[PDB]
């Protein structure tokens, strides 16, 4: 998902 | 809390060769995955600090990513194709281990894996 979270959730 | 060192991609004490199948792992299999629009989570070792994943390296003891694999192939680090294939398998398993079944990253990972398998079926 998000670039900021490496595509990881929460 | 700290990241571990990344996997080795080079070693002068390991003998070297180029094979048709390793060329294919680089320029067909890795090339296809690397350019896919879902590659980006997998293109580099997981940065636990920067990503604030403090449990990642408690849970994942055998980390692997496509950054490392590409490097390994470029560095003639593998002697046998299955060594490389094993690294891909490890990358995909880790994803399934750490992430929840419903997470979008798991669906990215399975999409890449299907492509991977389809390519391995045509190895020379």
Numbering used by the authors:
A (entry chain D): 7 to 16
B (entry chain A): 42 to 165
Sentences from the paper on this structure:
BETs, like all of the 42 human BRD-containing proteins, contain additional interaction domains that recruit other proteins to the acetylated protein target, forming complex assemblies and contributing to processes such as chromatin remodeling and transcription. Multiple decreased interactors harbor sequences that can directly associate with BET-BRDs in canonical or new BRD-mediated structural binding modes, and we propose that the tandem BRDs present in each BET protein may be capable of simultaneously recruiting both a histone and a second interactor.
Interestingly, only K14ac bound within the BRD cavity, while K9ac packed outside of the cavity, next to W81. This resulted in an inverted peptide orientation compared to Kac-XX-Kac peptides. Importantly, the conformations of S10 and T11, and their contributions to the stabilization of this helical topology, also suggested a functional role for their post-translational modification during binding. Phosphorylation on the longer linker on histone H3 (Kac-X4-Kac; the second Kac being outside of the BRD) affects BET binding, potentially linking cellular signaling events to epigenetic circuits.
